[PDB]
Design a protein around this nucleic acid. Sequence first.
RNA 1: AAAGCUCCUUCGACGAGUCGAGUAGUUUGGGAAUGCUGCUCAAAAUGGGAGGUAAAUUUCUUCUAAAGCUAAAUACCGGCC
RNA 2: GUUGACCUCGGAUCAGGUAGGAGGACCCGCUGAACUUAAGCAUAUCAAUAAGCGGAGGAAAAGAAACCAACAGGGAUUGCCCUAGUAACGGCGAGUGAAGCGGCAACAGCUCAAAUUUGAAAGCUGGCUUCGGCCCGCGUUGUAAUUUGGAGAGGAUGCUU
Lengths: 101, 152, 209, 202
Amino acid sequence: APVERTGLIRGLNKGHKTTRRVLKERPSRRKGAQSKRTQFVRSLIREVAGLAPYERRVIELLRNGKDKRARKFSKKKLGTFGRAKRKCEELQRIIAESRRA
Amino acid sequence: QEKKERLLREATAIKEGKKKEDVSKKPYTVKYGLNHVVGLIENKKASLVLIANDVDPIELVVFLPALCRKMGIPYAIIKGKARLGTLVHKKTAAVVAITEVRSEDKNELAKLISAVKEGYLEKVEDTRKRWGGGIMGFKAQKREEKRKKSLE
Amino acid sequence: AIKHNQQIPNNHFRKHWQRRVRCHFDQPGKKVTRRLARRAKAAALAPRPVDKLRPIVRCPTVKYNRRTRLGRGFTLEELKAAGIPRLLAPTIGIAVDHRRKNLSEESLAANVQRLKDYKARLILFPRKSNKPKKADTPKDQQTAETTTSLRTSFGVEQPLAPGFTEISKSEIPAGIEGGAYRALRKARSDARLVGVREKRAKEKAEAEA
Amino acid sequence: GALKYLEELSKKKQSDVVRFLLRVRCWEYRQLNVIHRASRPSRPDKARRLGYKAKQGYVIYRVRVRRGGRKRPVPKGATYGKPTNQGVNQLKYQRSLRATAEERVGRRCSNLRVLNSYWVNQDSTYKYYEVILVDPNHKAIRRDPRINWICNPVHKHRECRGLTSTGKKSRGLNKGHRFNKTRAGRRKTWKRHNTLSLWRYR
RNA sequence: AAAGCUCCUUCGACGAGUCGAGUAGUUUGGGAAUGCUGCUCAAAAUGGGAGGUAAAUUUCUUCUAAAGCUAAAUACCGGCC
RNA sequence: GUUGACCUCGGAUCAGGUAGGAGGACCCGCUGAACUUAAGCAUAUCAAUAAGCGGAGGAAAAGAAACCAACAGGGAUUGCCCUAGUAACGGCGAGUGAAGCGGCAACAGCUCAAAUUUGAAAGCUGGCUUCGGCCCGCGUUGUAAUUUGGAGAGGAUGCUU
Ligand SMILES: [Mg+2]
Ligand SMILES: [Mg+2]
Ligand SMILES: [Mg+2]
Ligand SMILES: [Mg+2]
Ligand SMILES: [Mg+2]
Ligand SMILES: [Mg+2]
Ligand SMILES: [Mg+2]
Ligand SMILES: [Mg+2]
Ligand SMILES: [Mg+2]
Ligand SMILES: [Mg+2]
Ligand SMILES: [Mg+2]
Ligand SMILES: [Mg+2]
Ligand SMILES: [Mg+2]
Ligand SMILES: [Mg+2]
Ligand SMILES: [Mg+2]
Ligand SMILES: [Mg+2]
Ligand SMILES: [Mg+2]
Ligand SMILES: [Mg+2]
Ligand SMILES: [Mg+2]
Ligand SMILES: [Mg+2]
Ligand SMILES: [Mg+2]
Ligand SMILES: [Mg+2]
Ligand SMILES: [Mg+2]
Ligand SMILES: [Mg+2]
Ligand SMILES: [Mg+2]
Ligand SMILES: [Mg+2]
Ligand SMILES: [Mg+2]
Ligand SMILES: [Mg+2]
Ligand SMILES: [Mg+2]
Ligand SMILES: [Mg+2]
Ligand SMILES: [Mg+2]
Ligand SMILES: [Mg+2]
Ligand SMILES: [Mg+2]
């Protein structure tokens, strides 16, 4: 039972009193989970293919450059700030690995 | 025909009541098929890999040298997709892997692996990293030669 | 052109509505056809009931929250608790819904008991009469008064809770301390002010450094 | 399997290797005919994913279609009506270039059933697709319950009736509030909403 | 041989010029943009979509797209009775 | 070196097949008006209609959630009643206008891609055959078996089919 309801409508924990059971996770909910082979295949394919032109531009703006410029450019390229920040984190990991290899 | 004969003798065996895989022994054969070979080198069972140099959609094999390097398995890009095919009784094979051999030619396998390593991989260790040439045509090459000779 | 005290007309007949008029002179004939189809399918399902067993389900919204009805099918958890195999349930007249979940022990237990009653009342004929298996009805309790309508014989016994109940005096519960109206006002105010109070509390906590 | 690697590689359309392959194959396809039989799928993973099988009765046809919007085919740009209908240039076709490619390939190979299609290349003036088709008269197809549903007459010219993937995309066939107008068919839903129902005992 | 159930450390592959974003046109009751399409940009891995007011941040809920088949209840007197 | 493989591309009144047209009331798409209403008229309305084009069947289409919801949660699709002339849209004018829940009719669930059968391509088309099989071809750039998230795979375990 996550949280027990107050038994009255119009409240912070409103709702009818039921003993809420915790249940095992359905296999659909695993969709975003990472796996060993997927990780292996994606890393090998990244090694084989390299970077995109916009990814190279972002990396150049990231190392010896401006993070606000990188953020703005990444958002312009990808369309969404969440995707832009995830891409910037991934390219930061790439830069760190390349520089500390 | 060999498979039919083996199945026939296994049939006589289990008609006599002797269990299967008693008349026949463990087979040692070369491994083919792209997905099968990829799985073998992923599980490190492959001892040597030969990749055809002329796979129409190179994509199917463009990652194979990198995969073999990552998994630490000796590979060689060999000439003849049709050659691998006729080796394996198909039209084409596009990839071939050898995992285990019999003891009478384990020494031959070791010799082949060492020779392939030191005579292909060590020589291509550097040339595999550079871009394919932008070679011009015959007349363009002659024009550039004339230009350089006139300049000097 | 309005001329008197009229309700403003808004009759949506400015399209060619006559092109799509649907009369219903075939209502009795369609009813007859439906009855014939029902009789034919009941005859085809000769000893079996004409429908599948359905679970009890609570209607979603805050309206209809109070009422139960029949659902689509029983969940995997309900079938497992009742001991009925998943592949065996749909072949013996039980509807299965793989996408419904049991978030509450009350619904889970009610549906499990429903399934157990159905299994207790089930008569299972052997696949071959000359060699019955241990899971089939052994030819002696195979004769009984059966039902052909699970929607009536296994309906919703009481969709609504009983609206009237008597308790003795001195068992009357004590009211909420400030009163029910005040309690509702307080709960509403707390829900309104949860975020502002949270940000103010964290601001005052962090003001020291 | 190598098809997972192929799937991952096909995502990297901006990489050097994929860009080089795309450029060269675009040149080759432009040199070839507008519609032509392809011996094998150039994207084996994509074809297998969309339902292609490597057995007799499965055919791949490559087609390129002209790119851009749909200019209104009126003489001298003169639409004869109200100003809201005077647009000529920036109008858009309601179906996809993929749908046009499938329709033309189906007309070329009437004897086959269009199973699916996929993008293979792009160009300034052309878009290139490979269409998977199935032979409904081949015995290898007619004997396979996994595919022989396409042998039934109700599946004649799926690409013409919008029953392929691109047709199901254009027609708005998805569940939810965002597809209220097109869930069950736009014209059918409109007829339902505009039908006046009169019962006997009104 | 094949098949179901009861428990389990572990593993658990899941559709890309696709989603999404911008812009243009059309359409919708869908209103800082409901669907569709053209062009440009162009993804990710507890990720992704949606949660009817545009945005950043933090949670929660719900499903699992970009492959496919499938009676019935429904329309229709065009055809044959 | 030539032949011989395989890769594309062709010839043939080669062997065997298939498509066209009709019908189009209903059905699935595309394309697409104006009369009219607004007491004028351009957005709007008529109308996502008529006309035009392509494609099916006895039904078609849709369909087993990247759904609805916000609840004590529902649970593929379709249709009727209601929601509701409502939310909303609209020179916010004329006018237009759904959906969830709820009752009912009818109910049905499924299979592929993504895994090595690798101790044996186990798969399939065509021809011949006494019926046991044989041959060619397709196919390893993957045809069978297994698996589809409701899981499953791997192990245990004793019953059951
Ligand atoms: Mg009129
Ligand atoms: Mg072929
Ligand atoms: Mg004119
Ligand atoms: Mg107008
Ligand atoms: Mg009346
Ligand atoms: Mg999927
Ligand atoms: Mg898109
Ligand atoms: Mg969107
Ligand atoms: Mg757009
Ligand atoms: Mg627009
Ligand atoms: Mg239009
Ligand atoms: Mg719009
Ligand atoms: Mg909201
Ligand atoms: Mg699909
Ligand atoms: Mg689907
Ligand atoms: Mg369908
Ligand atoms: Mg002939
Ligand atoms: Mg002919
Ligand atoms: Mg015709
Ligand atoms: Mg007027
Ligand atoms: Mg007038
Ligand atoms: Mg006038
Ligand atoms: Mg309209
Ligand atoms: Mg018409
Ligand atoms: Mg019918
Ligand atoms: Mg159908
Ligand atoms: Mg599903
Ligand atoms: Mg739910
Ligand atoms: Mg429903
Ligand atoms: Mg609008
Ligand atoms: Mg309208
Ligand atoms: Mg209902
Ligand atoms: Mg035969």
